[PDB]
Design a protein around this ligand. Structure first.
Ligand SMILES: CNC(=O)c1ccc(Nc2ncc3cc(C(=O)N(C)C)n(C4CCCC4)c3n2)cc1
Length: 262
């Protein structure tokens, strides 16, 4: 069906290792959307051309208000085109840059949305979404959208590289090279809850090497303003042992979440 001729192209919203994301508009409907362009040369060089095919099929069947929708896709001789939902308010990472840190009501509301999205994902055996805030977008209603599909893409305003942000969110079992399961998403939720409340991710260090040690040894501390309920949820999510991490339904029922979420 689709071809590049079906779209008007506007400015690049961001750029990544594999290509760019453009503001775009379907000509007939004048619908605004995000056109993600991946260069086949880059996909081939990295050896991920088979992984892209699988994730396109997965993404084509994920339908949830807090997951960025894939409308369709096509290709030409040099490029793959993903026709994505456009999230008009940008990344949560940028919101965090602007506000420095989130209050407990905003944080608990965002965590609720993500826990619901991740529960849906898990129900389809979809695990390990990279939910660093650079991959979380804000829809027109301010609702969170998981948008890690098709690899990282940064806006010009970003000050954290793809490798650094992804490392900040990696769980000990994947740094220690062990088997992992869907509990990696619970770990990521704890890192995110902390970054939301603090304005910095908990294991940030000068070097990647020190960050590895801090993650593996779960070495993090709380600023004085983090309330006891927030400490309790974050401490349960950032357990080294994945079996000790709560179920997503237990996150949603956590007293700090229910007391503060919209
Ligand atoms: C001052 N305005 C802004 O910074 C702004 C930035 C993006 C949007 N919309 C928007 N909509 C859909 C997307 C899909 C991606 C993407 O492939 N990611 C891996 C996440 N991205 C990225 C592009 C670069 C930042 C997120 C999307 N971005 C609106 C406003």
């Amino acid at each position: 069906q689709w071809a590049l001729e079906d779209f008007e192209i506007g400015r690049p919203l961001g750029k990544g290792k594999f290509g760019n994301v453009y503001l775009a508009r379907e000509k007939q409907s004048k619908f605004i959307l995000a056109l993600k362009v991946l260069f086949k040369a880059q996909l081939e060089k990295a050896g991920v051309e088979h992984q892209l095919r699988r994730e396109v099929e997965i993404q084509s069947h994920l339908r949830h208000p807090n997951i960025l929708r894939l409308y369709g896709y096509f290709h030409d001789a040099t490029r793959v085109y993903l026709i994505l939902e456009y999230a008009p308010l940008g990344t949560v990472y940028r919101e965090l840059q602007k506000l420095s840190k989130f209050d407990e009501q905003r944080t608990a509301t965002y965590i609720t949305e993500l826990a619901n999205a991740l529960s849906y994902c898990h129900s389809k055996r979809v695990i390990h979404r990279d939910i660093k805030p650079e991959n979380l977008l804000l829809g027109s209603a301010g609702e969170l959208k998981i948008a890690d599909f098709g690899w990282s893409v940064h806006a010009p305003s970003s000050r954290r590289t793809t490798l650094a942000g992804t490392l900040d969110y990696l769980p000990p079992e994947m740094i220690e090279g062990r088997m992992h399961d869907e509990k990696v998403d619970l770990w990521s939720l704890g890192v995110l809850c902390y970054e939301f409340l603090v304005g910095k991710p908990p294991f940030e260090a000068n070097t990647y090497q020190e960050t590895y040690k801090r993650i593996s040894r779960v070495e993090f501390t709380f600023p004085d303003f983090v309330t006891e309920g927030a400490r309790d949820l974050i401490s349960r999510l950032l357990k080294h042992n994945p079996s000790q991490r709560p179920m997503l339904r237990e996150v949603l029922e956590h007293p700090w979440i229910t007391a503060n979420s919209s």
